[PDB]
Design a protein around this motif. Sequence first.
Motif, PDB file in Angstrom:
ATOM      1  N   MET A  81       0.906  13.057   1.289  1.00  0.00           N
ATOM      2  CA  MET A  81       1.770  12.018   1.841  1.00  0.00           C
ATOM      3  C   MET A  81       0.867  10.981   2.494  1.00  0.00           C
ATOM      4  O   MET A  81       0.231  11.262   3.514  1.00  0.00           O
ATOM      5  CB  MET A  81       2.754  12.596   2.858  1.00  0.00           C
ATOM      6  N   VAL A  82       0.796   9.793   1.901  1.00  0.00           N
ATOM      7  CA  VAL A  82      -0.045   8.711   2.398  1.00  0.00           C
ATOM      8  C   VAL A  82       0.868   7.574   2.831  1.00  0.00           C
ATOM      9  O   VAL A  82       1.675   7.078   2.036  1.00  0.00           O
ATOM     10  CB  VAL A  82      -1.050   8.240   1.338  1.00  0.00           C
ATOM     11  N   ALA A 120       0.824  -1.203   0.000  1.00  0.00           N
ATOM     12  CA  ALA A 120       0.000   0.000   0.000  1.00  0.00           C
ATOM     13  C   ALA A 120       0.860   1.255   0.000  1.00  0.00           C
ATOM     14  O   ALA A 120       0.557   2.219  -0.708  1.00  0.00           O
ATOM     15  CB  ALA A 120      -0.936  -0.008   1.207  1.00  0.00           C
ATOM     16  N   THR A 121       1.929   1.269   0.797  1.00  0.00           N
ATOM     17  CA  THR A 121       2.817   2.425   0.814  1.00  0.00           C
ATOM     18  C   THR A 121       3.481   2.620  -0.541  1.00  0.00           C
ATOM     19  O   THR A 121       3.591   3.751  -1.031  1.00  0.00           O
ATOM     20  CB  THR A 121       3.874   2.259   1.907  1.00  0.00           C
ATOM     21  N   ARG A 122       3.928   1.530  -1.167  1.00  0.00           N
ATOM     22  CA  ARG A 122       4.530   1.645  -2.490  1.00  0.00           C
ATOM     23  C   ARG A 122       3.531   2.205  -3.494  1.00  0.00           C
ATOM     24  O   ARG A 122       3.874   3.075  -4.303  1.00  0.00           O
ATOM     25  CB  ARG A 122       5.048   0.281  -2.947  1.00  0.00           C
ATOM     26  N   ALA A 123       2.288   1.720  -3.455  1.00  0.00           N
ATOM     27  CA  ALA A 123       1.275   2.210  -4.384  1.00  0.00           C
ATOM     28  C   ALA A 123       0.954   3.678  -4.135  1.00  0.00           C
ATOM     29  O   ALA A 123       0.793   4.454  -5.084  1.00  0.00           O
ATOM     30  CB  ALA A 123       0.009   1.363  -4.271  1.00  0.00           C
ATOM     31  N   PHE A 124       0.854   4.079  -2.867  1.00  0.00           N
ATOM     32  CA  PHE A 124       0.472   5.441  -2.529  1.00  0.00           C
ATOM     33  C   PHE A 124       1.608   6.437  -2.701  1.00  0.00           C
ATOM     34  O   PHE A 124       1.349   7.644  -2.756  1.00  0.00           O
ATOM     35  CB  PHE A 124      -0.031   5.508  -1.086  1.00  0.00           C
TER      36      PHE A 124
END
Lengths: 50, 50
Positions: free
Chosen positions: B12-13, B1-5
Amino acid sequence: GAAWGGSYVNDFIDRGRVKKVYVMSEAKYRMLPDDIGDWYVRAADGQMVP
Amino acid sequence: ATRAFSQIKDAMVFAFNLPAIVELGTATGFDFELIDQAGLGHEKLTQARN
């Protein structure tokens, strides 16, 4: 009361700290009983009554 | 999820798991407090932090 004993009005900021604000008579105008004659009060018509 | 966001712009997500003990919160690093001790002000404290 404000003249002869002081009155705490509100707060102010001194170097980032909340501190009191006092209004009082100058020393020499609240020393002797005769000094009571130096103070006047405004009437509804704007006159100064001793 | 962090990589996608990370592709998201204008935000900043960051996705993350819970701490084992949420009451203590994270114990990963250090928590440091920079204190204004001489009434420098907000701007001077910001410069010191920078």
